[PDB]
Structures are given as C-alpha cells and as structure tokens.
Amino acid sequence: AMNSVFSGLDMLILLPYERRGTRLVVEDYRPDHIYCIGADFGKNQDYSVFSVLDLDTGAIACLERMNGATWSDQVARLKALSEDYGHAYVVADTWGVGDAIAEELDAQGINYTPLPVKSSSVKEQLISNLALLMEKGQVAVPNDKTILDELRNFRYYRTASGNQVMRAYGRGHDDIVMSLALAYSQY
C-alpha cells in the first residue's frame, strides 16, 4: 500500500508464543532483564492491549489483549503482568481513560508512567519511533496474524486542512499498534 506507515514490516522479527487465555506468552520473566508494559486501555467496547517489552533485548515477552473487560479488571490484569515481569513499569496512555482508571492505577499501587496520547503530534512521535526501530530490525513481536495485520493496515491520511493523520485502514482498530508504540517509546 502506497500510504503504509510501517514500510519496514519486512524487518519485523516474528516470535513463537503460547496462547494462555488472553495472553500471548513468548517468554517467561528473566530476572536479569528490565521490562516495561505499553498499555492501551479498553476505554469502552474497544480492545485493551498490554505489551510487555524486555528492554534489554527489545523483544515483546508477552502481549495481553481483550475487549469488554471491566475497567477494574483491566487494572488488575495490568497489575498481574507487572508483577509477573518483576514489577515492570507501565507506560500508560491515560488520555481520556476516565477518572476510575486514573484513580485505580494510583489506588492499586501500579508502577506506571503516564504517556497521554493527547494529539496527532504525540501519536506521530510514538509511531515514528516504532517505525524506525522496526526498519532497523529491533522490533520483535508475537507471530500472530491479528498483530501483523493491524500493523500492515496502519496508514497515513490527511485532514481537511492538510495535517497528517495515522490510523487503521477502513474501519479497523489500532489498539495493538498503540500498545506496541507505547512500549517501544522506552527502548
């Protein structure tokens, strides 16, 4: 596609995994490594995606995805992932998530840093970083067709005034794309 964002998809490293319910587990926790978790919440009927990145290797160790999970359940699942990966810190897109998730992150003692995806400018910085790392052969994800498809279908458009926009082709989703970009913002 002429308007592909991820022109370096050919350099994406593809990793085998075990599906454990809502998790795709590439590898279990290694305590000599430091991890973070990109978190795109399930604000309403959209998916929540939590991407555990090994910051020593640049590889996704685990990716959890679901939709329709309660807000509290999303936070509990994030807590469990964080704890599983050595109190991995969460890079949380807190923009427009609502008071309950924001309060729950603090109330539950989640190890997190806010990265609100609050404009097209912020989004472009996150995505361009992911795209560059990808072309450089530094991005490694679970070899799952849904993940690869969501990256393949992430495209450039232009607004009425001529500003750049990045979004899913057609009527698609970008929760996986954004979760991965949030994780890799730290790499």
Find the binder of Ca ion among 24, 134, 175, 183 (CB under 5 A).
175
Residue (40 or 144) nearer to Ca ion, CB: 40
Name the DSSP class of 130: H
CB-based contacts of 92, cutoff 8 Å, min separation 6 = 39, 41, 105, 110, 112, 113, 114, 115, 182
CB-based contacts of 42, cutoff 8 Å, min separation 6 = 48, 66, 67, 68, 69, 71, 74, 175
Residue (95 or 169) nearer to Ca ion, CB: 95
What minimum distance in Å lies between the beta carbon of 77 and Ca ion? 13
What minimum distance in Å lies between the beta carbon of 28 and Ca ion? 26
Residue (40 or 150) nearer to Ca ion, CB: 40
Find the binder of Ca ion among 27, 46, 135, 149 (CB under 5 A).
46
Tell me the CA distances in angstroms from 16 to 60, 101, 168, 181, one per residue in order: 11, 32, 25, 20
Residue (144 or 175) nearer to Ca ion, CB: 175
> Which of 187, 172, 93 lies closest to 140, judged by CA?
187
Which residue is associated with the tokens 């989640």?
110
The span of 132-140, 146-154, 159-167, 170-178 binding Ca ion (CB under 5 A) equals: 170-178
The span of 11-19, 46-54, 94-102, 155-163 binding Ca ion (CB under 5 A) equals: 46-54
At 109 the three-state DSSP class reads: coil
Angle in degrees, 0-180, between the axes of helices 120-135 and 175-184, rounded to the nearest 10: 70
Pull the structure tokens for residue 130: 């992911």
Find the binder of Ca ion among 26, 37, 40, 53 (CB under 5 A).
40
The span of 7-15, 40-48, 60-68, 115-123 binding Ca ion (CB under 5 A) equals: 40-48
The span of 55-63, 100-108, 151-159, 173-181 binding Ca ion (CB under 5 A) equals: 173-181
Which residue ranges make up the site for Ca ion (CB under 5 A)?
Answer: 40, 46, 175
